[PDB]
Amino acid sequence: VDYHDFPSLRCELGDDGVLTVVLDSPGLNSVGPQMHRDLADIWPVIDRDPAVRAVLVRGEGKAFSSGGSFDLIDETIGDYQGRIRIMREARDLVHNMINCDTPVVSAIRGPAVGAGLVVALLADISVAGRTAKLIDGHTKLGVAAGDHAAICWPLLVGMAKAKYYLLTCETLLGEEAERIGLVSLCVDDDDVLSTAAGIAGKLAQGAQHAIQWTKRSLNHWYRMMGPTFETSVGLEFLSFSGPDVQEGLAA
Amino acid sequence: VDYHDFPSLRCELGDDGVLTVVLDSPGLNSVGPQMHRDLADIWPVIDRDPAVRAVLVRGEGKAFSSGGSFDLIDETIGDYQGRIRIMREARDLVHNMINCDTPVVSAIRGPAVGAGLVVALLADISVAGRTAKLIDGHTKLGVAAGDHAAICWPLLVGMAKAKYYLLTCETLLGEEAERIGLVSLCVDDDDVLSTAAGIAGKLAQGAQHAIQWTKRSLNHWYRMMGPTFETSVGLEFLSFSGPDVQEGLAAHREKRAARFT
Amino acid sequence: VDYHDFPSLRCELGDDGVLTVVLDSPGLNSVGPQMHRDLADIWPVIDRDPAVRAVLVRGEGKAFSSGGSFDLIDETIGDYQGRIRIMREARDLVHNMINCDTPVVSAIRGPAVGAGLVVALLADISVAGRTAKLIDGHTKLGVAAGDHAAICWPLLVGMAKAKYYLLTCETLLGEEAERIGLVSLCVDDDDVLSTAAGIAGKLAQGAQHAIQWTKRSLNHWYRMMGPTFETSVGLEFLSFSGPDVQEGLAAHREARF
Amino acid sequence: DYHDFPSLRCELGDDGVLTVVLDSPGLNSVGPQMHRDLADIWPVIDRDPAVRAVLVRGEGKAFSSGGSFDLIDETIGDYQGRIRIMREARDLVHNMINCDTPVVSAIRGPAVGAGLVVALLADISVAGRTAKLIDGHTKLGVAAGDHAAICWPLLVGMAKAKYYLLTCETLLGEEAERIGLVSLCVDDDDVLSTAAGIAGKLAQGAQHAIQWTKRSLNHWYRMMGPTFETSVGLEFLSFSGPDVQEGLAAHREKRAARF
Amino acid sequence: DYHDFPSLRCELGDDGVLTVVLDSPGLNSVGPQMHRDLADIWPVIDRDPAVRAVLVRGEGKAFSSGGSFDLIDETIGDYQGRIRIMREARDLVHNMINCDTPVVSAIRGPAVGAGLVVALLADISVAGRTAKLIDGHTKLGVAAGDHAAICWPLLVGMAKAKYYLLTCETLLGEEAERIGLVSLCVDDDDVLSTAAGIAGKLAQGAQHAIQWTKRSLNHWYRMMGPTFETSVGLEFLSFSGPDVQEGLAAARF
Amino acid sequence: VDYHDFPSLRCELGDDGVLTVVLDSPGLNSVGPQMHRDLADIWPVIDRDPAVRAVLVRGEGKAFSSGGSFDLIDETIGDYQGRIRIMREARDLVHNMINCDTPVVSAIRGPAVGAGLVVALLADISVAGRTAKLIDGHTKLGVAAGDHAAICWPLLVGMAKAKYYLLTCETLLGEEAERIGLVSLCVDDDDVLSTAAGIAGKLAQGAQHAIQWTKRSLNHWYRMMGPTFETSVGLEFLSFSGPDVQEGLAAH
Secondary structure, eight states: OOGGGOTTEEEEEOTTSEEEEEEOOHHHHOBOHHHHHHHHHHHHHHTTOTTOSEEEEEESSSOSBOOBOHHHHHHHHHOHHHHHHHHHHHHHHHHHHHTOOSOEEEEEOSEEETHHHHHHHHSSEEEEETTOEEEOOHHHHTSOOTTTHHHHTHHHHHHHHHHHHHHHOOOEEHHHHHHHTSSSEEEOGGGHHHHHHHHHHHHHTSOHHHHHHHHHHHHHHHHTTHHHHHHHHHHHHHHTTSSHHHHHHHO | OOTTSOTTEEEEEOTTSEEEEEEOOHHHHOBOHHHHHHHHHHHHHHHTOTTOSEEEEEESTTOOBOOBOHHHHHHHHHOHHHHHHHHHHHHHHHHHHHHOOSOEEEEEOSEEETHHHHHHHHSSEEEEETTOEEEOOHHHHTSOOTTTHHHHTHHHHOHHHHHHHHHHOOOEEHHHHHHTTSSSEEEOGGGHHHHHHHHHHHHHTSOHHHHHHHHHHHHHHHHTTHHHHHHHHHHHHHHTTSHHHHHHHHHHHTTSOOOOO | OOGGGOTTEEEEEOTTSEEEEEEOOHHHHOBOHHHHHHHHHHHHHHHTOTTOSEEEEEESSSOSBOOBOHHHHHHHHHOHHHHHHHHHHHHHHHHHHHTOOSOEEEEEOSEEETHHHHHHHHSSEEEEETTOEEEOOHHHHTSOOTTTHHHHTHHHHOHHHHHHHHHHOOOEEHHHHHHHTSSSEEEOGGGHHHHHHHHHHHHHHSOHHHHHHHHHHHHHHHHTTHHHHHHHHHHHHHHTTSHHHHHHHHHHHOOOO | OOTTOTTEEEEEOTTSEEEEEEOOHHHHEEOHHHHHHHHHHHHHHHHOTTOSEEEEEESTTOSBOEEOHHHHHHHHHOHHHHHHHHHHHHHHHHHHHTOOSOEEEEEOSEEEHHHHHHHHHSSEEEEETTOEEEOOHHHHTSOOOSSHHHHTHHHHOHHHHHHHHHHOOOEEHHHHHHTTSSSEEEOTTTHHHHHHHHHHHHHHSOHHHHHHHHHHHHHHHHTTHHHHHHHHHHHHHHTTSSHHHHHHHHHHTTSOOOO | OOTTOTTEEEEEOTTSEEEEEEOOHHHHOBOHHHHHHHHHHHHHHHTOTTOOEEEEEESSSOSBOOBOHHHHHHHHHOHHHHHHHHHHHHHHHHHHHTOOSOEEEEEOSEEEHHHHHHHHHSSEEEEETTOEEEOOHHHHTSOOOSSHHHHHHHHHHHHHHHHHHHHOOOEEHHHHHHHTSSSEEEOGGGHHHHHHHHHHHHHTSOHHHHHHHHHHHHHHHHTTHHHHHHHHHHHHHHTTSHHHHHHHHOOOO | OOGGGOTTEEEEEOTTSEEEEEEOOHHHHOBOHHHHHHHHHHHHHHHTOTTOSEEEEEESTTOSBOOBOHHHHHHHHHOHHHHHHHHHHHHHHHHHHHTOOSOEEEEEOSEEEHHHHHHHHSSSEEEEETTOEEEOOHHHHTSOOOSSHHHHHHHHHOHHHHHHHHHHOOOEEHHHHHHHTSSSEEEOGGGHHHHHHHHHHHHHTSOHHHHHHHHHHHHHHHHTTHHHHHHHHHHHHHHTTSSHHHHHHHHO
């Protein structure tokens, strides 16, 4: 198996069975049409790849991802058929990460916004920098938060924190995110990647079935909320034809 | 739309599209029979009022609510028909808040007990003062905790904390409440009201569908526990016919500590 | 009602209607074949005993329980009918504790591991010492975490913390456990027992139906995850026939999977 | 007061039975006003102490042909209208299922789309042998998001739900009873009397016993709320798609659609 | 030994089938002791190595007419008794559902209320053509909260479930089988022998296979536990209402 | 796209946008090692194929599938890694079919057993021959019914019929299967194939999103039973290490 079907992504296989997946693109790793599809569809390939034992996922440089690019949001608003495509991709990103038994570790440095946040937060283990900026962003942009949060935030931070950050879109930094249960760990910015790599390395060298089946069991908690998640997806893509988003991209 | 159908409630529409809903009654805003119905029934009306874009709910003065009045409890204990009316109101309060798409911010100062705590905690964004007193209160009175906690607490503070506080009825202060995830925010007592108004104002001026649909999606987590919550409701209202609640009431009126066993 | 049908467990009924259930056995209160069955089957009996109004469950000495003994694991690996018997006990432990309406307080000093952690955490109110060691332990041994965690951890600590600790098997100390929501209370190691006995005592003097029906209502959150729990059980017991557990057990005699 | 719902004729009987009548042109088509009134009447009925049961029917020999040409046209061509219709669709199902007052439906002739929603979410549905029960969504070119995803598998089993909802083959009242979709099948002439009898007997019954039995059973539908809401969203997304123009053209032209 | 259940006659055959018979005046009416015994037997059966299947039936030509007048009176008239009867009603459904041993019911004549519970929660139910299946609760003036909310929609679909449970119209075995409420309908005289045969074959089958198939299918009911327990609470509340005192008399509310 | 990654299955793309998936193998289309994997992994590929608008799935000749082959059963009992590989495939077959938005029609003639019955019944629309034999078969073989039945039978035939057939393994013929709700339709054996094709063709010509989104919404009723289904998978594959399936196999 080769990761050439995913040309927007940089996939590197170490000797320990860790696959590094890097988001590397302009505008602090913004997610364009090709990356949005690649992020969605890579997971079932990784999960059938016998050479891979763990995934380490990150952005290049001092940033996870600023999320969807101007062009991606444009297409979503201005074209039905493209909207439908991008919607299916948003759905599958969540469904495929959640159904991937291979453990995943995220190293979150700088911003993680929208589609980028999905990947950051649906990793099994998430490592955030003290100063990392975790931004769901949807309500301020003017659309419903339908790309992951309804499937997991309550079961990460409890309903009172979830409602607060998701409705207000107040900025949440890695240190406070760790305090409230959104991420597994918080470490100094400079140590985010090495901390994550070590965990990923340990998982890769661990007892495989034990690890994967533990993951899989726990993931039933998210899968049970699949219909609630897909409601949120529908409502988000509906809202993309609404007035507010026009003002929202302008700001 | 006018809020005259809810005479125990003072409702004030702001310039900002925020409806302030004030609980104001004697005994630190105790909830009597009219207010129990009014609290239960107002939400569906609020939700269809095109002039309202957010709700700020609070108590008059420096108290949220002491919960059900002695008259309310007496009626529950002593009369079948009244018990069922109250039970329907208890159930609908939770169901109607949770099905209300309009965002709600609570400003929690002083005590928020029983039926008052329901409203304080089912608000989307709850703002508690450092020394605010959050008291479910049911097991110490001698009845099951069936008025909201079973639909939400484990998804607020996790099961180990839910069980500790709901079973022992130990008082929980605002600061500790925020630490463990029960409320959205903890501020100084003198800042609760302006902080809550700030948040309500900002939601009212935001992307309406985005906000309402996000909230609605999140509320499915509570909706999926309706049957569990309705179990808790039946168990509480059944326990009102038991001897323990008579003792709890009697102990209170008699200024002593309850002896249940 | 006589607790003589559970010979590996010491059961002492106080004046206050508190049943103290002590776990006391070699290797830090390890759970052998008899205790595994006793711990599973004791709860329905306690739940129907009118002399009991609360349970306080603890380890003898400065340990809660190290979980499965080497012999119990050996049988699980070596013998099919034994494995099935044990798997049924594992499932029943969780099911029974969760359907016990009588309130249960755990006093956690020292290690609570595997089967030991199950009982410590499915108590209604868990009191952990500052340095108590809470270790699920499954992935480190080479088996799926199928003995309780999948029914409850996401709803105790949130999924990010649940995965961290269940996948890595990093040790969790009672103070940190309390911070992230795994346990009800953290007190000084020297104050664990009295804090817990005090809590059991209050519960046992409380309004019985109110307390029991509140617990029951709350327990529906775990009961709706039964199929997810039973999934994890099967995956654990399937993985007992895998190579990794032979390596993981050998490692703990003398860890390279 | 029921004058808040001017599209619907609401007649209170001596027995405590509220009769609710869908009376309009094109075999009781549901236009803008009726779509909202149908959605919003149930919580008011539920809180009315005069009412102990509901009998719901169409005027004459028809239940409802469903959405009128106008209502569909709005859904297709106007955004804010589409949202208002969407909310209404969601609320009809949600409000019917949360109405504790028992509801009996008298199904004669066509019961299509929006009209079918009311006919099938009734607690007790009485179908004439020749009644035509038609979901209609895939044939019209939109997802079936107005009620079927919340109940059909639990009425007819997933094999029949898939067959009828995907193909949109017509279901006659007789075959509908055989497969579990409706409570009872009778001769077209007895539908109305059979239904009124049942409404009457429930209205005379033990009020809490009946309302609480129905509430309990309705949890099976409530637990499917998020699945239903997915279906609503998808139906309303599909209304911006290319198929529905051709689907409505095809309907209006008494011909088979060419997608 | 089943001596802890004095109201029930339990006979173990040479094939591993444990026959459980309800035998009591008034067509096997279920009194205080029977109500507790029926609730508390299944966990014992399920850990009994000698038992491989259960065959449950009434004595004579009747399954059970349900709770007796005195059991009902107790529910109406006293709180501690009402609560005990409630725990029993709830554990009956729970304990049958959690019993991995397969259970065949042989239903002849009436099966009403508490007795219908056992009839329908058996894994395989055999009804006679003229067996009378009567949930009975609304006719009696209480919510139907002793089992139907955990199973009927998944047996007969919601339209049929609502019709029979709201009206309490009598449902005969032949019609019960057609709508999917019972596994099988046979001629009245063949009920017991058809049921015994089925239980016999099950007692001889591959044990883990059978029990685990059944267990897995039972999750469909376990997931509906809270909805069931909602219906239990609603039934027991309604026993304090006015309707039931009249309904026990009979039927005019 | 490339159906050559599925060596055990014959995939033919029609003019009407219908992909016909033929199960054509020894022993009345028995499912061996290669077919068990191919059946599991094909569905996500189909669902992403823009050339395909509907699937017609069928066995070669007058038989759907006799299910898992002797070798597959021997591999399940005999070897741990292979047992685990087979278990994953059983799990994913059910998971992937139910998550495939593309409408699927099954044409059921003669026997459809175990692993074949899976594909047959999780088709959106199943067309059954009057004398087609639908056999779950797991209790007769000595293993828990963990390959699909626990995700769907109660919502097909109701619990009383589910427990009768799955516990006893009594034979269920296509006519009776339709009566009780297990299959969409029952036609004469000779008409199964053309009836299935017609239905596939119509669906393939329909409003694509309308159909796919309706089926997806309905399929949530199955996704919500995923953990019950996975419990059953687990109990089946555990029971393969038991003493019972030795005799069970030796018989057939």
